[PDB]
Symmetry: C3
Subunit: 191 residues, 3 copies
């Protein structure tokens, strides 16, 4: 039976970066994890239906459309969990124009049944200055108070996940200049 790890964090905080660095560090110690980006799973579905051109248009779609593709992505990822350990790079909540949407509503949560939910955080300062540094995404320059609001709600959603499934909720700080301490923390967790 395989370990299913969810890594979450607002855009710019480094959930994806922490995850790639962690899996390569685990493979050097002999530990096999698969990286899966939840948003890519969805975007293959959405791109195939013609609803979007790029992945940062997904959060602006009608939220019933997002929840339909949200569920197909979660089913395809649950299939992956049978065949290897998996780390899911995704989001505790997604900021849509109609409010925060839970990234793992109970029906999605119950099919992944994640063993651990990791929250990657740093100060909204660093997140904002990091967003201003990367035209690689159509990332929202919000205020730091909007990022602080998102990290607040993401904690609430994640602790709810832990009440429903029994998963532990691990907060890892990923601060400017200290990416390496965060990789130590996440590696220490996955043993």
């Amino acid at each position: 039976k395989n370990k299913v790890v969810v890594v979450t964090g607002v855009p710019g905080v480094g959930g994806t970066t922490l995850t790639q660095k962690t899996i390569e560090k685990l493979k050097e110690e002999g530990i096999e994890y698969k990286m899966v980006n939840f948003g890519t799973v969805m975007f293959e579905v959405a791109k195939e239906e013609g609803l979007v051109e790029d992945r940062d248009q997904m959060r602006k779609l009608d939220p019933d459309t997002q929840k339909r593709i949200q569920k197909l992505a979660g089913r395809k990822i649950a299939e992956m969990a049978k065949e290897s350990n998996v780390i899911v790079d995704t989001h505790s909540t997604v900021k849509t124009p109609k409010g925060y949407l839970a990234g793992l509503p109970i029906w999605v949560l119950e099919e992944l049944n994640p063993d651990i939910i990791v929250i990657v955080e740093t100060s909204s300062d660093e997140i904002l200055m990091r967003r201003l540094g990367d035209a690689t995404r159509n990332r929202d320059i919000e205020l730091t108070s909007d990022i602080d609001e998102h990290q607040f709600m993401n904690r609430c959603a994640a602790m709810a996940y832990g009440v429903l499934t029994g998963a532990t909720v691990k907060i890892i700080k990923n601060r400017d200049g200290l990416l390496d301490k965060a990789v130590e923390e996440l590696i220490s967790v996955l043993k």
Copy 2:
């Protein structure tokens, strides 16, 4: 099917004023929502049983009585949602002497099945100053820190609602003098 929108906010933050101003501007365009204050539905029952004289006495009743009448109101409101779109002006949590009571415990939540949960917020400074200026109600002069504690727990309960049903959780600021921008935001969320 018909849209169910829940609007929430601590007393004094203007949840009711935002709900009435938004609905009337939508009627200028022919877009009909029916306003339903959850507490009025509760107060009609409580007063008919002889439990209270006014609506601000209900949260000081035995919490078992409140949950009894709370459950009746959710069913009565759910029936209304069959006859038109509804915005439910109500509360993420209610402050009772025995603690915060969820405004939508899970059985009520599943009976209303809302699409959107709106959290109306502003500074506890501005809330306190409105309660002191409001001769329609017997509003509690709490410390500003008790108001911030109530807005903290309201966020927590609301994100739990979004985890359990999939409803999106929208935060809207309703600042002094800027009621109209808050009305503009909600109208936009409801299109």
Copy 3:
């Protein structure tokens, strides 16, 4: 119908002390509550299976094994409530190296079905300083920001418990030198 009250709080905040003092002043009024420490119940099962020698080793055990023992301890505490009122001295979340673990995952929460969930809080300064004078544990000297992080997540979990069951969620300040005032408050809450 018998009362089930849950009192929760980070280590060092005085949840245990507040429960014992409240029960003695209540018996002077003829009000019988039974104290139950969830961890003591867990440790009885655990030491009988040989997993630990002392109780601070339990939160570092296999979270598959902890939830098996948390599951049985919640079931043993439910039986106690059939025979008397009970105050359960436990924790909203337990801080493990694998993250925060909900103390009442939904299946444990529903077996206890508490009426009131008390959160004991004070400033992270006072908790930290209390941990330093306490040779009954090797007490966790965390930073004050980690103690604050733990109290933030305990609020999130507790409000989720209130959404799922209907329990009221009561915050009680247990400040240095003012234990007797926190005791008055809890007594007042239980009448």
